[PDB]
Design an enzyme around this catalytic site. Structure first.
Site, mmCIF file in Angstrom:
data_model
loop_
_atom_site.group_PDB
_atom_site.id
_atom_site.type_symbol
_atom_site.label_atom_id
_atom_site.label_comp_id
_atom_site.label_asym_id
_atom_site.label_seq_id
_atom_site.Cartn_x
_atom_site.Cartn_y
_atom_site.Cartn_z
ATOM 1 N N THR A 138 0.883 -1.488 0.128
ATOM 2 C CA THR A 138 0.041 -0.024 0.071
ATOM 3 C C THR A 138 0.902 1.428 0.006
ATOM 4 O O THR A 138 1.983 1.359 0.692
ATOM 5 C CB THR A 138 -0.944 -0.374 1.204
ATOM 6 O OG1 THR A 138 -1.900 -0.787 0.662
ATOM 7 C CG2 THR A 138 -1.762 0.964 1.442
ATOM 8 N N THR A 139 0.504 2.212 -0.718
ATOM 9 C CA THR A 139 1.166 3.484 -0.732
ATOM 10 C C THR A 139 0.088 4.482 -0.467
ATOM 11 O O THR A 139 -0.889 4.645 -1.479
ATOM 12 C CB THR A 139 1.796 3.694 -1.988
ATOM 13 O OG1 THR A 139 2.647 2.753 -2.542
ATOM 14 C CG2 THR A 139 2.408 5.160 -2.175
ATOM 15 N N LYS B 224 -9.073 2.979 -1.318
ATOM 16 C CA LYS B 224 -8.412 3.331 0.159
ATOM 17 C C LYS B 224 -8.636 4.806 0.590
ATOM 18 O O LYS B 224 -8.153 5.020 1.626
ATOM 19 C CB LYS B 224 -6.936 3.091 -0.008
ATOM 20 C CG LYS B 224 -6.622 1.845 -0.062
ATOM 21 C CD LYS B 224 -5.192 1.384 -0.798
ATOM 22 C CE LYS B 224 -4.824 0.031 -0.849
ATOM 23 N NZ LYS B 224 -3.611 -0.091 -1.691
ATOM 24 N N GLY C 214 4.806 1.581 0.892
ATOM 25 C CA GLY C 214 5.587 2.242 -0.245
ATOM 26 C C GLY C 214 6.037 3.604 0.239
ATOM 27 O O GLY C 214 6.885 4.060 -0.472
#
Lengths: 227, 228
Positions: free
Chosen positions: B1-2, B33, B131
């Site tokens: 996830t970033t 998200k 990330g």
């Protein structure tokens, strides 16, 4: 005259007679010649046949030891074959450990070292062969000879075996800076046909090999049509 | 996830990738998200999908009630405080890194970070997820205060593309939303139009020389492409 029974003993004059005797086996063997052109190196040798019923390729005296290098044996062939195995192992070691094709000068010095060690110990005898080494790696074309004493030298042209005195005379009338690998095959073969003695050895053939630019610095037998 | 959020003059931009994974397999390639908490306040979610969905929903429920009781729109600081309290009271049983960001007329555009452990920090930009580690240096070198809304959208799209080209746990779409005094503006960029990837960067077109052909020299040149 007990001084000539093993290779581990000097004579009073400073000689090692077992090594001299081993050299006499090379001097009585069949003739070989070689030449270093600007392109490459050419080797040729006389095979004395013992029967008219042999297959072609039998008792070959010339052997590849890496992609770019080869060896020719004079004198006793099974002794020569033990040196060929050693040389193959040194060329592989150089590729596996140092990531290079073995330079010609290094290959010749390892072959010399190996032959010398059999002139030092009461339990072994000297080899009865001289080896011609022909190579074209990153140090250019190179031609060397190693003898039973383990002495090693570099040449522009060379002859070995029982025709060598006359053959040397004829190699001295070549021009080494100028000659190509296709001319060389014709001249070298001529010298070998001329020194052949027709009384003693009735059946014979010639074996010829090279490494040059034409071949992509791959050491190989010349195709049987060029003789 | 970033995930990330950045402040600009008069608001904020939130951005994320769209991948959800079990480690080496992608279960959803188009997650969302960026979760809405009130008309002009959003969060970004990282960690356990189950835990972040559950705490976002509870925070939103409490803000809707508060807004009805006062008859006014809520401030970003109230949403951050409610969310912080839920993260801190449940810290041993959850995996969650949150960013809360939004616009209100008292303080303008605001960004708060609530990492694992339940602390609460008020910043100019925030990064989160696996990330993020790839982006600290990108911001240290290329971020400035006072960007415009369009500068800031473009910058965050680029930042997300850099992180997801190097992080195996991020990928897919880039989603953004911009919050200011006007209406919220969402945007989705597909992978095919990403502003950066390794696959199309010209310095990575030519292959390394790992498989050189058998040769008479030690010079290294090209890879072997056909049988001898």
């Amino acid at each position: 005259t007990e001084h000539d029974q093993s290779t581990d003993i000097f004579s009073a004059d400073g000689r090692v007679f077992q090594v001299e005797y081993a050299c006499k086996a090379v001097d009585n063997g069949s003739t070989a010649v070689a030449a270093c052109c600007t392109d490459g190196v050419v080797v040729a040798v006389e095979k004395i046949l013992t029967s008219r019923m042999l297959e072609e390729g039998s008792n070959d005296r010339i052997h590849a030891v890496d992609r770019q290098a080869g060896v020719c044996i004079c004198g006793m062939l099974p002794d020569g074959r033990a040196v060929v195995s050693r040389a193959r192992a040194e060329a592989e070691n150089s590729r596996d450990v140092f990531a290079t094709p073995i330079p010609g000068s290094v290959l010749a010095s390892r072959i010399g070292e190996f032959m010398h060690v059999y002139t030092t110990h009461y339990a072994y005898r000297p080899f009865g062969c001289s080896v011609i080494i022909a190579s074209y790696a990153d140090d250019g074309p190179q031609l060397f000879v190693s003898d039973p004493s383990g002495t090693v030298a570099g040449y522009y042209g060379i002859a070995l075996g029982k025709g060598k005195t006359v053959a040397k005379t004829e190699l001295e009338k070549l021009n080494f800076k100028s000659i190509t690998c296709d001319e060389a095959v014709v001249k070298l073969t001529k010298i070998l046909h001329d020194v052949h003695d027709k009384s003693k050895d009735k059946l014979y053939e010639l074996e010829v090999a090279w490494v040059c630019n034409k071949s992509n610095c791959v050491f190989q037998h010349v195709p049987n049509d060029m003789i | 996830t970033t995930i990330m959020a950045v402040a600009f003059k008069g608001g904020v931009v939130l951005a994320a990738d769209s991948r959800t994974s079990t480690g080496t397999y992608v279960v959803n390639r188009a997650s969302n998200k960026l979760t809405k908490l009130a008309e002009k306040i959003y969060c970004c979610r990282s960690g356990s999908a189950a835990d972040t969905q559950a705490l976002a929903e509870q925070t939103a429920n409490y803000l809707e009630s508060y807004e009805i009781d006062t008859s006014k729109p809520v401030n970003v600081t109230t949403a951050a405080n409610i969310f912080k309290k839920l993260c801190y009271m449940n810290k041993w049983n959850i995996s969650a890194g949150i960013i809360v960001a939004g616009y209100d007329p008292l303080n303008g555009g605001s960004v708060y970070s609530i990492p694992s452990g339940g602390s609460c920090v008020k910043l100019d930009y925030a990064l989160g997820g696996s990330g993020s580690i790839f982006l600290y240096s990108f911001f240290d070198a290329n971020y400035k205060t006072g960007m415009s809304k369009e500068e800031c959208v473009c910058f965050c799209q680029r930042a997300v593309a850099h992180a997801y080209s190097r992080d195996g746990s991020s990928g897919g779409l880039i989603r953004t939303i911009a919050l200011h005094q006007g209406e919220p503006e969402d945007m989705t960029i597909p992978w095919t139009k990403t502003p950066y990837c390794m696959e199309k960067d010209p310095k990575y077109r030519d292959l390394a020389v790992q498989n050189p052909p058998f040769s008479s020299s030690a010079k290294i040149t090209v890879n072997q492409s056909r049988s001898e």
